[PDB]
Amino acid sequence: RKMERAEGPASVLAIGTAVPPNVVYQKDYPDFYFGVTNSNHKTELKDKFQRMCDKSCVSKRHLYLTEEILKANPSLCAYWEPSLDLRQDIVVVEVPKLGKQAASAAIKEWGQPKSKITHLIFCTTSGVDMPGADWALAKLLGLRSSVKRLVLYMQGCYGGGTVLRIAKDLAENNKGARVLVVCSEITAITFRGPSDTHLDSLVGQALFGDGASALIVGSDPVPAVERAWFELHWTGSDILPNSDGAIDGHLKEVGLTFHLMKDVPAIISKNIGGILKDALAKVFPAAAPPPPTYNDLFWITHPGGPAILDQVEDRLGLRKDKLASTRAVLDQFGNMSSATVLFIMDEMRKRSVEQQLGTTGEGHEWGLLLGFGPGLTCETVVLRSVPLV
Amino acid sequence: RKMERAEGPASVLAIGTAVPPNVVYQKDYPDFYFGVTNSNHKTELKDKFQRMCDKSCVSKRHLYLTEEILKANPSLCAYWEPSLDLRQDIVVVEVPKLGKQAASAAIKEWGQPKSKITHLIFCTTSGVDMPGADWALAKLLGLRSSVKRLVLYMQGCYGGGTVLRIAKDLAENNKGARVLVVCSEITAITFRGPSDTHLDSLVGQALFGDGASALIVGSDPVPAVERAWFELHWTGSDILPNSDGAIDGHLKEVGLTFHLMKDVPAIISKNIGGILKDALAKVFPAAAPPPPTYNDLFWITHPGGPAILDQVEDRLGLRKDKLASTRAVLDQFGNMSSATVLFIMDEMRKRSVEQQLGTTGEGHEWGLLLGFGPGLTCETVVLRSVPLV
Numbered sequence: 001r002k003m004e005r006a007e008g009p010a011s012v013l014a015i016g017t018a019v020p021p022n023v024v025y026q027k028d029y030p031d032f033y034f035g036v037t038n039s040n041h042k043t044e045l046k047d048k049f050q051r052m053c054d055k056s057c058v059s060k061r062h063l064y065l066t067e068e069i070l071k072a073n074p075s076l077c078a079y080w081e082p083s084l085d086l087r088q089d090i091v092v093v094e095v096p097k098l099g100k101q102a103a104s105a106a107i108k109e110w111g112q113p114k115s116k117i118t119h120l121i122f123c124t125t126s127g128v129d130m131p132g133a134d135w136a137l138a139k140l141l142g143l144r145s146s147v148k149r150l151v152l153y154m155q156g157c158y159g160g161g162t163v164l165r166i167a168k169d170l171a172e173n174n175k176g177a178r179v180l181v182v183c184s185e186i187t188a189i190t191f192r193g194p195s196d197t198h199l200d201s202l203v204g205q206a207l208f209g210d211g212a213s214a215l216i217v218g219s220d221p222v223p224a225v226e227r228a229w230f231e232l233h234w235t236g237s238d239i240l241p242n243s244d245g246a247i248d249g250h251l252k253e254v255g256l257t258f259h260l261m262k263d264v265p266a267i268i269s270k271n272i273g274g275i276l277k278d279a280l281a282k283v284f285p286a287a288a289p290p291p292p293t294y295n296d297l298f299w300i301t302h303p304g305g306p307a308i309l310d311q312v313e314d315r316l317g318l319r320k321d322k323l324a325s326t327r328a329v330l331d332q333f334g335n336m337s338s339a340t341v342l343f344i345m346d347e348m349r350k351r352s353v354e355q356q357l358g359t360t361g362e363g364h365e366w367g368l369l370l371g372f373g374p375g376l377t378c379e380t381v382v383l384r385s386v387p388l389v
Numbered sequence: 390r391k392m393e394r395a396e397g398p399a400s401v402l403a404i405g406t407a408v409p410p411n412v413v414y415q416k417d418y419p420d421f422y423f424g425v426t427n428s429n430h431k432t433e434l435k436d437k438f439q440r441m442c443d444k445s446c447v448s449k450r451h452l453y454l455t456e457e458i459l460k461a462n463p464s465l466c467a468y469w470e471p472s473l474d475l476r477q478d479i480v481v482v483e484v485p486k487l488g489k490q491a492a493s494a495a496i497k498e499w500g501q502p503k504s505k506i507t508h509l510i511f512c513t514t515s516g517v518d519m520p521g522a523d524w525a526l527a528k529l530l531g532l533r534s535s536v537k538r539l540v541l542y543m544q545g546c547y548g549g550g551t552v553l554r555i556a557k558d559l560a561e562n563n564k565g566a567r568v569l570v571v572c573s574e575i576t577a578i579t580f581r582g583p584s585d586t587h588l589d590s591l592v593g594q595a596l597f598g599d600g601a602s603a604l605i606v607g608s609d610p611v612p613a614v615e616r617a618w619f620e621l622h623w624t625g626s627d628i629l630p631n632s633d634g635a636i637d638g639h640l641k642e643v644g645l646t647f648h649l650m651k652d653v654p655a656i657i658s659k660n661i662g663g664i665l666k667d668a669l670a671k672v673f674p675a676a677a678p679p680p681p682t683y684n685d686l687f688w689i690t691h692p693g694g695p696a697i698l699d700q701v702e703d704r705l706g707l708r709k710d711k712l713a714s715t716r717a718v719l720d721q722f723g724n725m726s727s728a729t730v731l732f733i734m735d736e737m738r739k740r741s742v743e744q745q746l747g748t749t750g751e752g753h754e755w756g757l758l759l760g761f762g763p764g765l766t767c768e769t770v771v772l773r774s775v776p777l778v
């Protein structure tokens with residue numbers, strides 16, 4: 001009553017992305033990384049890393065950190081050196097800055113003045129501060145001083161689902177609300193030299209990249225003025241069984257540490273079916289249309305690593321093209337933690353318009369966005385596409 | 390549609406609180422603190438601290454840290470020693486544990502089984518981890534594995550407003566949703582020895598205490614089954630003008646640092662009037678009932694320090710009893726960052742039932758909850774009380 005609510009489903013009205021300009025191709029990374037960390041003498045460890053990169057299904061990544069910066073800051077090149085203050089000094093500044101680039105692109109596409117942003121959600125796994133990255137981004141953009149802000153820190157790879165789950169309620173419960181949603185990630189918080197005693201940290205050095213994505217989310221788009229690309233219809237969150245300690249990350253004096261068990265793909269792939277069947281049963285209940293088949297949904301899946309995608313595709317019997325947009329982003333950007341699924345959403349709508357398909361979801365009506373991260377946490381969003389032309 | 394929404398205003402259905410058992414009386418704190426930090430020879434600095442404690446309007450605080458723990462961990466007793474890993478090891482465990490005590494009390498009052506909790510918001514300024522304090526609390530309580538979680542880290546003293554602003558939308562936009570809201574704060578993240586070059590850190594040693602509060606928030610309470618205590622009707626957030634750097638806190642290798650300018654009370658007190666007049670004009674628009682006067686509202690004000698309360702009371706012309714519940718909590722608990730306003734909400738409803746007043750807000754119908762923190766951020770919540778008997 002005192003605050004009127006909206007009527008239609010929360011919708012994605014624009015998407016922007018941004019990446020550091022420095023690109024490192026995966027074929028060059030093993031020599032680049034063991035050279036800059038003064039580890040080339042550890043030949044066996046390096047050959048293990050070569051095999052990880054060869055199997056990563058990542059062709060290239062964008063990285064804030066460059067050879068110059070690393071040689072200037074030797075504490076980032078060792079494996080276990082006090083370096084948190086240095087890392088924070090970097091990402092407390094650069095994470096909002098990259099988010100600002102992505103947010104400016106999203107606002108430009110949206111087409112409305114930036115003062116119509118009423119809410120801001122900023123999600124990151126890269127650094128913490130008070131005031132936070134949300135405050136910094138609001139300052140960089142010049143948002144209204146009364147924007148309702150929320151900073152989601154230390155989220156990890158499920159955060160792209162989390163921000164949609166929250167943005168849905170902000171948009172739908174507040175008439176006129178327009179929510180800027182930013183995920184921004186920079187691996188300077190976690191980059192460190194190699195050690196043959198922590199081989200799971202090696203995996204992160206093969207897969208993690210930098211990037212930021214931004215959405216405008218709102219209900220009741222103004223006809224002929226704003227344009228919906230996807231609709232948020234259902235959300236769910238689950239802690240998978242027997243996953244205690246599957247994915248851990250601690251903010252230590254040596255920076256952000258990464259711990260990752262070899263059974264993560266098995267835990268995800270063996271439990272995701274029941275989760276999706278339950279979610280789809282809630283969205284398409286019997287009392288009535290049956291749920292679409294997996295092959296008739298579009299898929300925006302966090303590519304935690306190729307083994308996760310391969311095992312999910314195998315266990316669910318997905319046709320080999322269902323994860324093509326997901327794998328394209330992994331190939332060209334690596335795993336960008338919470339930002340990754342929004343890059344995939346952008347890739348999917350852009351391919352759909354390019355190829356003149358009938359909807360923003362590759363021609364399918366309904367779709368799924370999945371985030372996976374520490375918990376082991378599974379975030380599920382059931383999405384509807386929008387018809388094209 | 391696919392997720393039905395609720396109808397009535399988000400309501401506080403129960404409140405629980407918890408504090409560490411160790412109490413330190415303010416009259417003992419100056420000798421306790423300069424002794425345990427081996428600083429008694431700094432007589433002038435100590436006399437400055439005595440005056441801060443004498444003027445703090447804090448009679449006692451609950452503190453996780455004890456003389457025993459501090460003597461066992463000398464790095465916490467110095468002013469600038471690497472200690473973040475040690476501090477985190479403490480609060481990553483103890484903050485959820487204290488939150489669990491407060492949440493269990495709230496659930497017991499609520500009276501419904503814990504599995505009816507559908508959402509969880511965990512807010513803290515004390516430590517960060519992945520998975521987070523939200524995950525840890527869900528595990529400690531045995532919440533449903535599908536609870537929709539949100540962890541708000543590095544929030545600071547406005548966080549009690551923030552959690553209500555978010556909980557309002559989760560409760561109202563989700564039919565049947567019952568939101569567990571926990572704020573939990575433990576000063577081990579920030580405690581350090583004194584230095585006469587950082588006199589604002591001294592202020593924190595005079596004012597900051599430990600505590601956790603928990604709410605059940607939901608719309609459409611079941612008649613004769615659940616009981617509403619306050620209703621959330623309007624929310625606003627503001628960055629106050631010319632407040633860049635007024636309140637900063639950085640998570641460093643020496644733990645959480647605190648920076649606080651002497652003009653914080655002036656910034657708050659000189660701007661709060663326009664903010665409240667605007668908020669009340671939105672809730673009571675003309676086109677119609679005029680807004681109640683300040684003296685006919687109930688007041689739940691974050692007691693950042695006595696100077697803030699005194700200057701707000703002076704600038705707004707508040708009668709001397711309006712801030713009595715606020716000052717009682719400051720007197721008996723200190724400044725517990727984000728948890729403090731929920732302790733005050735509990736104190737107010739408990740006094741109201743005890744004294745047989747006509748509403749949960751001291752006999753007034755409408756009220757204001759105000760959080761202040763880094764930004765300088767002002768969180769405003771317009772509340773309605775509930776009639777008593």
Ligand SMILES: CC(C)(COP(=O)(O)OP(=O)(O)OC[C@H]1O[C@@H](n2cnc3c(N)ncnc32)[C@H](O)[C@@H]1OP(=O)(O)O)[C@@H](O)C(=O)NCCC(=O)NCCS
Nearest residue numbers: 048051052055056199200260261262264304305306307308
């Ligand atoms: C890493 C990966 C891309 C390549 O591995 P793969 O295609 O299965 O190929 P292999 O089985 O040859 O693995 C190569 C090496 O990686 C090692 N490895 C893989 N996962 C590892 C882990 N979590 N910890 C330590 N070593 C690991 C293997 O032990 C092997 O070492 P070896 O050649 O010396 O025996 C793949 O395992 C993967 O994608 N895993 C999932 C990644 C993940 O969990 N990310 C989630 C994000 S938080």
Ligand SMILES: CC(C)(COP(=O)(O)OP(=O)(O)OC[C@H]1O[C@@H](n2cnc3c(N)ncnc32)[C@H](O)[C@@H]1OP(=O)(O)O)[C@@H](O)C(=O)NCCC(=O)NCCS
Nearest residue numbers: 437440441444445588589649650651653693694695696697
């Ligand atoms: C600290 C306080 C409780 C007591 O101060 P007071 O009642 O004004 O009394 P005084 O003016 O004598 O202040 C006592 C001493 O505190 C010092 N002091 C107060 N605020 C200070 C600050 N932010 N930084 C450094 N010193 C400070 C004064 O300089 C004075 O030192 P002195 O006796 O050597 O001159 C009061 O100033 C206050 O409540 N301030 C607001 C606290 C605050 O901003 N908290 C927000 C939470 S993040």
Ligand SMILES: O=C1C[C@@H](c2ccc(O)cc2)Oc2cc(O)cc(O)c21
Nearest residue numbers: 156157185186187209210249258337
């Ligand atoms: O170790 C960190 C690094 C991180 C990250 C990735 C990319 C980037 O650009 C910045 C940070 O994401 C994570 C995600 C997790 O679920 C667990 C983790 O431990 C981590």
Ligand SMILES: O=C1C[C@@H](c2ccc(O)cc2)Oc2cc(O)cc(O)c21
Nearest residue numbers: 545546574575576598599638647726
């Ligand atoms: O320096 C920290 C300490 C902290 C805190 C208080 C009490 C407690 O029990 C735990 C932590 O709250 C803060 C609140 C702020 O707005 C800014 C800050 O820098 C801090």
